[PDB]
Amino acid sequence: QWALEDFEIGRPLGKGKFGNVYLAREKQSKFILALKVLFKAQLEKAGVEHQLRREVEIQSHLRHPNILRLYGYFHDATRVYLILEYAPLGTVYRELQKLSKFDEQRTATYITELANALSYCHSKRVIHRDIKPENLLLGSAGELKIADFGWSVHATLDYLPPEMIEGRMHDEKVDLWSLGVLCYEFLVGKPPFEANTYQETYKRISRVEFTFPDFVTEGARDLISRLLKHNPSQRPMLREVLEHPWITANSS
Ligand SMILES: Cc1nn(C)cc1-c1nc2c(-c3cnn(Cc4ccccc4)c3)c(Cl)cnc2[nH]1
């Protein structure tokens, strides 16, 4: 029986649609962790109880150095608390906008981290689907740790694949797309399909319309091209990515 006053709540780490996340310390052990607080009301209202059960049930039974651990859960009358591992070095999201953009070496590292983490998820038939820089956290060693399985399951739209947005059947190849989009954003500082309008982005994703800035190598260009295909099955397995020369050359 875990309950709210077993923890002391620190600065608010993230804000969210439904709930927030704070730094927290369990009193008995002095254990630092992140503590997601969700609001029953808003969840019921948007009817996502199932997806929360999913997230929890999925992230709870996952073991990998690049996947934010989920230690436990509990809830009171009004809210639900998710007890999570804490990422000292923050989010890649801020990391990017802070650094403007990433070199090929950092980029290719973060990708192999993801690809590893994703292989794993797929090796358990789990599609994250919602992979974006505000879901990628940095460990104390600066390692990438994916998180927020609020849209995870089994076999804004910038990071969604066409099949998804059009309302069609999808699979592990979803993450491959995201891996693509993500790789592009690291190098360029902006997602390939970004746009002022929703339905404008939709079109660009649907028609697959992107164009590399001058400063991206044929190598990078390559990977990204192979990775962003309208046809899910044209997209490389994760093994293929991991051994993509440009990644080999520069990953670490
Ligand atoms: C931000 C930030 N700066 N520094 C130095 C560390 C962090 C940090 N954030 C986290 C976080 C964290 C934050 N946001 N989110 C996602 C979210 C937020 C609000 C509602 C729903 C989902 C996770 C976590 Cl879980 C786990 N560890 C974290 N560490």
Author numbering: 127 to 281, 292 to 388
Kindly provide excerpts from the paper associated with this entry.
Over the last decade, extensive research has been directed towards the discovery of small molecule inhibitors of the Aurora protein kinases as anticancer agents. We have previously reported imidazo[4,5-b]pyridine-based inhibitors of Aurora kinases including 1 (CCT137690),10 the dual FLT3/Aurora kinase inhibitor 2 (CCT241736),11 and compound 3 which selectively inhibits Aurora-A over Aurora-B12.
As part of our medicinal chemistry programme to discover selective inhibitors of Aurora-A,12 we introduced the 1-benzyl-1H-pyrazol-4-yl moiety at C7 of the imidazo[4,5-b]pyridine scaffold to provide 7a. In biochemical assays, 7a inhibited both Aurora-A and Aurora-B with IC50 values of 0.212 and 0.461 μM, respectively. This structure shows the ligand in the ATP binding site with the pyridine nitrogen atom hydrogen bonded to the backbone NH of Ala213 and the imidazole NH interacting with the carbonyl of Ala213, consistent with previous reports of the hinge binding mode for the imidazo[4,5-b]pyridine scaffold. Similar to crystal structures of previous compounds 1, 15 and 16 (compounds 51 and 40c in Ref. 10, and compound 21a in Ref. 11, respectively) the N-benzyl substituent on the C7-pyrazole is oriented towards the P-loop, making Van der Waals contacts with Val147 and Gly142. In an attempt to improve the aqueous solubility, the Aurora inhibitory potency and kinase selectivity of this sub-series, we explored the introduction of basic substituents such as 1-methylpiperazine and pyrrolidine as well as replacement of the phenyl ring with a more polar heterocycle. This approach was guided by the ligand/protein interactions observed in the protein crystal structure of 7a, which showed that the N-benzyl substituent on the C7-pyrazole is oriented towards the P-loop.
